[PDB]
Every structure is written in C-alpha cells, then in structure tokens.
Design a protein around this ligand. Structure first.
Ligand SMILES: [Cl-]
Ligand SMILES: [Cl-]
Length: 162
C-alpha cells in the first residue's frame, strides 16, 4: 500500500465538477478548484488547471496528472515547512504517509495548527496523539476518514485501509 492508493481510497475519483464535503468545487482525486460559490469560477479554474476547455469534465488521465501534482506539492510543502519538516523527519514511513494525507486534505497551514498533536507525534506518544487529533473539527466533520488516518498514526500499519 502506498500514498497514492491511500489517498485514492479516501478521496474517490470523480470525472465531473463536484462539491466536496464542505461544499467547495472539486474535480478528480480531491483536487479543490475554488472556494468561490460560483460554478463559473470553477469551470474557469478547471480550464486554467488543464490548459484547455473542459467545460466541467475531465478524463481519468487528466485526473491522475493533477493527482501526481498535488501529492508532489504536499510532500514539498511539508519539507519546506519549519513546523512540519521536523515531525516528518522523525517519523517512520507509514506514519509519514498519514501526515501527507492530512496535508493534502487540509493544507499545510491547517496541519501546522495542530501544535499539541504534532508535538506528541514527534515524541512518539501514539495513544496520546490519537486522543488529541480526535478533538478537532476535522474529526467531527469527516469521522471515518479521520479514524482511518488516526489509526495509521496510532499503529504504524496499513490496517485501517485493509
Ligand atoms: Cl493546478
Ligand atoms: Cl468521513
């Protein structure tokens, strides 16, 4: 199991503009297009992203191209972040995937706000970090996805995805 397979389970694949759990316009494998209410702004952002007129629809290939970019951006973002980088460096490979997951869903800024959790992960206090991560809007809003990521941090295995 790898990051791509993990995120593909958590995000799904959709070939037409859709709205995310939050109500924002998204396409492909969790690729956020815009927070603006306009479907029009969304279609425009899409054309911009693909370099062509898409009229709200994309191919799988396009979906995967965007997915490669997003995961790359997530990883580079963590490695250039003062708060995130040390956490990431201290973790084993599986738990590294779980941090990437969070960053991809919630952005670098979002994750960096989980101060106390990050601190406990750095210290390898698995059970305690698990309890603290669940005390969040994140958990309350997408509890099954949150549980899966949380379990990955707790155990250091792919069991939640398996
Ligand atoms: Cl883009
Ligand atoms: Cl969920």
């Amino acid at each position: 199991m790898n990051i791509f397979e993990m995120l593909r389970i958590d995000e799904g694949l959709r070939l037409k503009i859709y709205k995310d759990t939050e109500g924002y316009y998204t396409i492909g494998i969790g690729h956020l297009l815009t927070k603006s209410p306009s479907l029009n702004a969304a279609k425009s952002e899409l054309d911009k992203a693909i370099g062509r007129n898409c009229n709200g629809v994309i191919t799988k290939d396009e979906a995967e191209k965007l997915f490669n970019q997003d995961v790359d951006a997530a990883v580079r973002g963590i490695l250039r972040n003062a708060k995130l980088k040390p956490v990431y460096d201290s973790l084993d490979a599986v738990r590294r995937c779980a941090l990437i997951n969070m960053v991809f869903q919630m952005g670098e800024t979002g994750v960096a706000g989980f101060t106390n959790s990050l601190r406990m992960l750095q210290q390898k206090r698995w059970d305690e970090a698990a309890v603290n991560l669940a005390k969040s809007r994140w958990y309350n809003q997408t509890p099954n996805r949150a549980k899966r990521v949380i379990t990955t941090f707790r155990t250091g295995t792919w069991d939640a995805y398996k």
